[PDB]
Design a protein around this ligand. Structure first.
Ligand SMILES: CO[C@H]1O[C@H](COS(=O)(=O)O)[C@@H](O[C@@H]2O[C@@H](C(=O)O)[C@@H](O[C@H]3O[C@H](COS(=O)(=O)O)[C@@H](O[C@@H]4O[C@H](C(=O)O)[C@@H](O[C@H]5O[C@H](COS(=O)(=O)O)[C@@H](O)[C@H](O)[C@H]5NS(=O)(=O)O)[C@H](O)[C@H]4O)[C@H](OS(=O)(=O)O)[C@H]3NS(=O)(=O)O)[C@H](O)[C@H]2OS(=O)(=O)O)[C@H](O)[C@H]1NS(=O)(=O)O
Length: 364
């Protein structure tokens, strides 16, 4: 299916974003959802025209994957909708929530066709609010909604300086994940161990310990191991990319991209074997203003007054004032796999190999 094209675009976009994010987010944890971001932008893209549309099409890698009422990319919006409904369905011991919303200044009338397309393809994804004379109340309402959707974890996503009387569009995107390990780690076996941030800096961390059969890629020439950890319920799994050397992370961050990740995680390289796993208990929250990042990736017009969103509104002045992303991830409970120094990780949707979260664990 073309779903593989959308999965590949998401991964290519994921590493485009990582390349920008790590410039400004050095020596700290990173956590974001390329999937929820690309879906948020796809919803905007549906209403973009001219150069703004062209820039988004290239930056989102849609150009590599009788006009329909919701545009030529209607098949892409449909695939995103079907994918999101799969992974956000709540199960026992599985909670993944995505909050995705474009807020529009009420004096910019929304074209009926765009409202219809959003209702069918991105339901509840568009709201009109009075930024002009109630921008601070609108901000608190938006932040409350994000806080509610993320089970209290993503607070104050839109900071006080971010909205004013001139705000016309705000793109808000948040993702929440709380999962449980398929092999429930022994409660009487998790213990406090040193996490070696560098060879010189150590911080204590609560380490989950598991001795079980896992798929693992052992790649000496790449100086890494990659462990697959299934979740208890749902169709998601975590991959952990552990550098062999204590500070081997930078070398891997310099070279990783979609093609390399595919080579390193090739099912032919994966072997099912008994592994003694030490993994830090992970509870990571990160918030990003993605405006600069997305402009640097080539979507400049979307965030300045020459934005062309005339598929959203006919109004004279429209642009995205802020694109903000909040991500929360929590996990709770032979060859060695001792993740006690900085590493990369991702959460993927197994049926489609789509990357849902990508991140760096730098320090407890
Ligand atoms: C580097 O960037 C620069 O170049 C790129 C690349 O373009 S290039 O290869 O030509 O060099 C530019 O990006 C491309 O162009 C964009 C753009 O021109 O807006 C954009 O194209 C998409 O949006 C166009 C505008 O849509 S609209 O709704 O805002 O009007 C659209 O063109 C229009 O299509 C409609 C249509 O067919 O529905 C036309 O409407 C008219 O025809 C209908 C019936 O047709 S019929 O044959 O007579 O029966 C009527 O129902 C309708 O009433 C009627 N309206 S009327 O006012 O004209 O009378 C309309 O005339 C067209 O202008 C594009 O559709 S297309 O089929 O004509 O190509 C649409 N392309 S799509 O999304 O791919 O399907 C895109 O961003 C991009 O298009 S591309 O093909 O992907 O490359 C970029 O703008 C430019 N930037 S710049 O340098 O800064 O300027």
């Amino acid at each position: 299916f073309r779903m593989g094209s959308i999965s590949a675009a998401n991964a290519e976009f994921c590493f485009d974003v990582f390349n920008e994010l790590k410039v400004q987010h050095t020596n700290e944890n990173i956590l974001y959802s390329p999937l929820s971001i690309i879906v948020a932008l796809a919803m905007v893209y549906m209403g973009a025209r001219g150069n703004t549309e062209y820039q988004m099409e290239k930056a989102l890698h849609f150009d590599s994957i009788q006009k329909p009422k919701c545009g030529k990319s209607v098949n892409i919006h449909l695939l995103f909708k079907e994918l999101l409904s799969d992974i956000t369905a709540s199960k026992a011991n599985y909670s993944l929530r995505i909050a995705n919303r474009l807020y529009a200044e009420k004096s910019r009338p929304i074209l009926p066709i765009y409202l219809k397309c959003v209702k069918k393809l991105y339901r509840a994804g568009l709201e009109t609010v009075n930024f002009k004379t109630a921008s601070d109340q609108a901000r608190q309402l938006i932040n409350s909604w994000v806080e509610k959707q993320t089970e209290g974890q993503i607070k104050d996503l839109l900071v006080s300086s971010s909205t004013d009387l001139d705000t016309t569009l705000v793109l808000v995107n948040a993702i929440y994940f709380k999962g449980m390990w398929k092999t429930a780690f022994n409660a009487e076996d998790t213990r406090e161990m040193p996490f070696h941030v560098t060879k010189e800096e150590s911080k204590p961390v609560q380490m989950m310990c598991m001795n079980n059969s896992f798929n693992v890629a052992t790649l000496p020439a790449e100086k890494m191991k990659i462990l697959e950890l299934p979740f208890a319920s749902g169709d998601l799994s975590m991959l952990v990319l552990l550098p062999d050397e204590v500070s081997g992370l930078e070398r891997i961050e310099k070279t990783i991209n979609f093609e390399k990740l595919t080579e390193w995680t090739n099912p032919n390289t994966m072997e099912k074997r008994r592994v003694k796993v030490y993994l830090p208990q992970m509870k990571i929250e990160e918030k990003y203003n993605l405006t600069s990042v997305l402009m640097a990736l080539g979507m400049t017009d979307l965030f300045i007054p020459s934005a062309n969103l005339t598929g959203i509104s006919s109004a004279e002045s429209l642009k995205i004032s802020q694109a903000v992303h909040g991500a929360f991830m929590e996990l709770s409970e032979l060859e060695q796999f001792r993740a006690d120094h900085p590493f990369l990780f991702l959460i993927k949707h197994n049926p489609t190999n789509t990357i849902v979260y990508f991140g760096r664990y730098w320090s407890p």
